[PDB]
Design an enzyme around this catalytic site. Structure first.
Site, PDB file in Angstrom:
ATOM      1  N   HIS A  77       0.807  -1.214   0.000  1.00  0.00           N
ATOM      2  CA  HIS A  77       0.000   0.000   0.000  1.00  0.00           C
ATOM      3  C   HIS A  77       0.843   1.267   0.000  1.00  0.00           C
ATOM      4  O   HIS A  77       2.050   1.231   0.232  1.00  0.00           O
ATOM      5  CB  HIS A  77      -0.955   0.022   1.201  1.00  0.00           C
ATOM      6  CG  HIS A  77      -0.267   0.015   2.530  1.00  0.00           C
ATOM      7  ND1 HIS A  77       0.119  -1.147   3.165  1.00  0.00           N
ATOM      8  CD2 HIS A  77       0.103   1.028   3.348  1.00  0.00           C
ATOM      9  CE1 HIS A  77       0.693  -0.849   4.317  1.00  0.00           C
ATOM     10  NE2 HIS A  77       0.697   0.464   4.452  1.00  0.00           N
ATOM     11  N   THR A 123       0.833   4.581   2.219  1.00  0.00           N
ATOM     12  CA  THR A 123       0.321   5.337   3.348  1.00  0.00           C
ATOM     13  C   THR A 123       0.197   6.790   2.911  1.00  0.00           C
ATOM     14  O   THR A 123       1.101   7.327   2.270  1.00  0.00           O
ATOM     15  CB  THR A 123       1.242   5.216   4.582  1.00  0.00           C
ATOM     16  OG1 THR A 123       1.355   3.841   4.966  1.00  0.00           O
ATOM     17  CG2 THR A 123       0.695   6.022   5.749  1.00  0.00           C
ATOM     18  N   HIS A 161       5.972   6.390   0.041  1.00  0.00           N
ATOM     19  CA  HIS A 161       6.636   5.173  -0.407  1.00  0.00           C
ATOM     20  C   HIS A 161       5.693   3.985  -0.425  1.00  0.00           C
ATOM     21  O   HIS A 161       4.641   4.004   0.211  1.00  0.00           O
ATOM     22  CB  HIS A 161       7.831   4.851   0.493  1.00  0.00           C
ATOM     23  CG  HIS A 161       7.475   4.690   1.938  1.00  0.00           C
ATOM     24  ND1 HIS A 161       7.293   5.760   2.786  1.00  0.00           N
ATOM     25  CD2 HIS A 161       7.250   3.581   2.682  1.00  0.00           C
ATOM     26  CE1 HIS A 161       6.985   5.319   3.993  1.00  0.00           C
ATOM     27  NE2 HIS A 161       6.951   4.000   3.956  1.00  0.00           N
ATOM     28  N   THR A 209       6.052   0.091   0.693  1.00  0.00           N
ATOM     29  CA  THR A 209       6.951  -0.856   1.332  1.00  0.00           C
ATOM     30  C   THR A 209       6.946  -2.137   0.514  1.00  0.00           C
ATOM     31  O   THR A 209       5.893  -2.721   0.259  1.00  0.00           O
ATOM     32  CB  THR A 209       6.539  -1.155   2.783  1.00  0.00           C
ATOM     33  OG1 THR A 209       6.118   0.057   3.417  1.00  0.00           O
ATOM     34  CG2 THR A 209       7.706  -1.741   3.557  1.00  0.00           C
TER      35      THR A 209
HETATM   36  N1  LIG Z   1      10.268   9.600   6.514  1.00  0.00           N
HETATM   37  C1  LIG Z   1      10.553   8.289   7.034  1.00  0.00           C
HETATM   38  N2  LIG Z   1      11.861   8.116   7.300  1.00  0.00           N
HETATM   39  C2  LIG Z   1      12.302   6.924   7.802  1.00  0.00           C
HETATM   40  N3  LIG Z   1      11.423   5.911   8.033  1.00  0.00           N
HETATM   41  C3  LIG Z   1      10.098   6.087   7.771  1.00  0.00           C
HETATM   42  C4  LIG Z   1       9.658   7.265   7.268  1.00  0.00           C
HETATM   43  N4  LIG Z   1       8.310   7.174   7.092  1.00  0.00           N
HETATM   44  C5  LIG Z   1       7.920   5.928   7.483  1.00  0.00           C
HETATM   45  N5  LIG Z   1       9.020   5.255   7.899  1.00  0.00           N
HETATM   46  C6  LIG Z   1       9.101   3.907   8.402  1.00  0.00           C
HETATM   47  O1  LIG Z   1       8.871   2.855   7.206  1.00  0.00           O
HETATM   48  C7  LIG Z   1       7.933   2.037   7.560  1.00  0.00           C
HETATM   49  C8  LIG Z   1       7.007   1.735   6.363  1.00  0.00           C
HETATM   50  O2  LIG Z   1       5.716   1.425   6.847  1.00  0.00           O
HETATM   51  P1  LIG Z   1       4.458   1.710   5.900  1.00  0.00           P
HETATM   52  O3  LIG Z   1       3.851   0.391   5.452  1.00  0.00           O
HETATM   53  O4  LIG Z   1       3.418   2.521   6.652  1.00  0.00           O
HETATM   54  O5  LIG Z   1       4.910   2.489   4.690  1.00  0.00           O
HETATM   55  C9  LIG Z   1       7.150   2.791   8.647  1.00  0.00           C
HETATM   56  O6  LIG Z   1       6.645   1.929   9.551  1.00  0.00           O
HETATM   57  C10 LIG Z   1       8.202   3.708   9.306  1.00  0.00           C
HETATM   58  O7  LIG Z   1       8.804   3.008  10.482  1.00  0.00           O
HETATM   59  P2  LIG Z   1       9.019   3.846  11.831  1.00  0.00           P
HETATM   60  O8  LIG Z   1       7.707   4.468  12.242  1.00  0.00           O
HETATM   61  O9  LIG Z   1       9.508   2.921  12.925  1.00  0.00           O
HETATM   62  O10 LIG Z   1      10.044   4.931  11.592  1.00  0.00           O
END
Ligand SMILES: Nc1ncnc2c1ncn2[C@@H]1O[C@H](COP(=O)(O)O)[C@@H](O)[C@H]1OP(=O)(O)O
Length: 142
Positions: free
Chosen positions: A25, A27, A104, A106
């Site tokens: 997905h 976010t 992004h 994942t």
């Molecule tokens: N700007 C960001 N920089 C670094 N890590 C991020 C950022 N945004 C989200 N993340 C992390 O990447 C993961 C991807 O999850 P998602 O499925 O929601 O895209 C998130 O859980 C988050 O982990 P965290 O909250 O521990 O930093």
């Protein structure tokens, strides 16, 4: 807050990559809201729908967002993100985090290194509002 309980998310028909993750997905914002605020958040979600589906989303490459986070970039989404950000803010809904927003998809929760493709356009299948570690309360299809 930086302990969100709900998030808005976007799901695409296909991904031009390979992914371990059970759910792929995009976010599109996290919220700290009370259930009596569920209707208002839904309205804005309803309000943004046309732009959300007129959005031109693309991927060009994959990268490691952070340690043990392997993702694909998305672009064409930031303007409508901040538009909706304004709408939530003006209705006094907690949306956003202290940390900057990076859009992004994942792909995996493991260390892998970059792949590339020609610019490719992602086609939205669904846009939803869901609770964190929880059920989906609301869904919109085109
Ligand atoms: N700007 C960001 N920089 C670094 N890590 C991020 C950022 N945004 C989200 N993340 C992390 O990447 C993961 C991807 O999850 P998602 O499925 O929601 O895209 C998130 O859980 C988050 O982990 P965290 O909250 O521990 O930093």
């Amino acid at each position: 807050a930086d302990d969100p309980n709900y998030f808005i998310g976007i799901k695409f028909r296909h991904i031009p990559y390979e992914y371990d993750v059970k759910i792929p997905h995009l976010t599109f914002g996290v919220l700290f809201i009370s259930d009596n605020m569920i209707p208002d958040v839904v309205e804005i979600m309803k309000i943004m729908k046309k732009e959300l589906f007129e959005m031109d989303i693309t991927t060009s490459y994959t990268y490691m967002l952070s340690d043990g986070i392997y993702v694909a970039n998305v672009s064409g989404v930031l303007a409508t993100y901040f538009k909706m950000y304004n709408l939530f803010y003006k209705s006094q809904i907690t949306f956003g985090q202290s940390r900057m927003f990076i859009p992004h998809i994942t792909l995996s929760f493991s260390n892998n290194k970059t792949v590339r493709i020609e610019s490719t356009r992602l086609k939205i299948s669904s846009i939803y509002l869901r609770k964190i570690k929880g059920d989906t309360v609301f869904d919109m299809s085109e």
